[PDB]
Amino acid sequence: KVNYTDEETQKRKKEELDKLMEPALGYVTKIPVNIPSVRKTEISEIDTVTDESLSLVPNEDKLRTIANENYGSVVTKSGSNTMNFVRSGYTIDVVHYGLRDKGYVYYKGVHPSKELPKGNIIVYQGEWDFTSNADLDAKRPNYNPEFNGYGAGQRVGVTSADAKERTYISKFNIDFSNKKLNGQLLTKTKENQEKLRYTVEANISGNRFRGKATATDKTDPILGKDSEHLEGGLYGPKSEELAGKFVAHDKSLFAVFSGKRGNDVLETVKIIDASKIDLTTFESSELNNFGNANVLIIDGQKIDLAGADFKNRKTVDINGKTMVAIACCSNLEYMKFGQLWQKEGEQTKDNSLFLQGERTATDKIPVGGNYKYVGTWDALVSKGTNWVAEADNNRESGYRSEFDVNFGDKKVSGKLFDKGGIVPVFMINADIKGNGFTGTANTTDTGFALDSGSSQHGNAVFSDIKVNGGFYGPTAGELGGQFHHKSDNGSVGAVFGAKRQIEK
Ligand SMILES: C[As](C)(=O)[O-]
């Protein structure tokens, strides 16, 4: 009166929806509420969830604050009683009236899966929830057989919480051999009759899936619009569970869903490596990753690692912390490694090395043939003084990593050089198993001087340090790995990557 909104073109609307396809630990949206002069409020406030705690309900704090100041009553559904790695549902003020916030609908999960079942078709079952938009002109009946009260969905978004004695159940079939999923979102009445509301189809990439939800009944004034923007992820170390959301193409619905597979013991395969070595404790810890090795996830937030140079320094603010990553290399398409630390003004804290890669499928690991791989590496050795390897582009005399891989004998042989070194400082010997390798890193008998480069200073020696690595890319044309050891006799953390060679 008069109400002005931004004129959104169809192109802009698609772009907006496309943005919502970015993988994240979770997502949350506000339940729409009409201001007095408007007749329709779309679903518009859709935020990523970046915290990693399963006990934190997205925006429940914001809601309880408003509820309390208005004597409301907050109720929260998460599925916390069934799921171990995912949460899905709503937090809602059930005695809501007027123009104040009603609540939120969300999903989130922890430990995006780094191992998937090897193959076959696996069943996941869970629940789903939703909020509609608010619309006076959507033919939503004053009396609704499915939803409680007067004019459900008309002035305030209607939700799964408002249903009359109905349960909202989800079922999925994941075909891990073809990386495809299908599913059904159903409603069950008190008389135990099921009605299919949406069919879901999606493709799996990394530990995420992207696809669509097709409304089964387009005459439904609330659950009647298709989505071409469904996205979710597998969660748990071994894809024990899933969770995701979809947004109706007209922003008239935001649905979330969860799922859990049965107790059957399945064989799994590694799809992702993503970890870091702390350069003070020389301990390894896992990083969150969604299957894109060129994206570094810190505190549920992302750092693009790609850049114009051989290796690139990225500097990103994450929760008031200035993170710095030096990521190598531009010739590696399916993996990245390098340094990571917190910029503490002039100093630096939590110095670490990281490595990420997208594992080759086991059935694409070559069965025979001998290949050279060439790349570089990053390392810290400490034994009184510090010795360092910093990733570089000098194949002749730099910090070279060189490998001979014999796929026939399932052997990897590697050499890690110091700059100017004529003999390597580390020798790697490993066995190939599935899409990775494991073995040892050894210095020579009498090892290498901590360069310095001093005629009184010490020498470092390491014996049978455990090495873990993977093959990355469609046909294992890239390889990488790491090793770490903590000792008073000397310590080391090292990451390396290399690119398969062709004889020119
Ligand atoms: C193109 As890629 C290695 O980020 O899947």
UniProtKB/TrEMBL annotation:
Residue stretches making up the Transferrin-binding protein B C-lobe/N-lobe beta-barrel domain: 116-261, 365-500
Disulfide bridge partners, by residue number: 328-329
Location in or out of the cell: Cell outer membrane; Cell surface
Membrane topology value: Lipid-anchor
Main location: membrane
Swiss-Prot/TrEMBL keywords: Cell outer membrane, Lipoprotein, Membrane, Palmitate, Signal, Virulence
Source taxon at top rank: Bacteria
Residue ranges annotated for the Transferrin-binding protein B C-lobe handle domain, each copy included: 270-360
Transferrin-binding protein B N-lobe handle domain ranges (all copies): 4-113
A GO CC term assigned to this protein in UniProt: cell outer membrane
Residues spanning the membrane: none
SUPFAM superfamilies recorded: OMPA-like
InterPro entries reported in the protein's UniProt record: OMP/PagP_B-barrel, TbpB_B_D, TbpB_C-lobe, TbpB_C-lobe_sf, TbpB_N-lobe, TbpB_N-lobe_sf
Name of protein: Transferrin-binding protein B
Gene responsible for this protein: tfbA
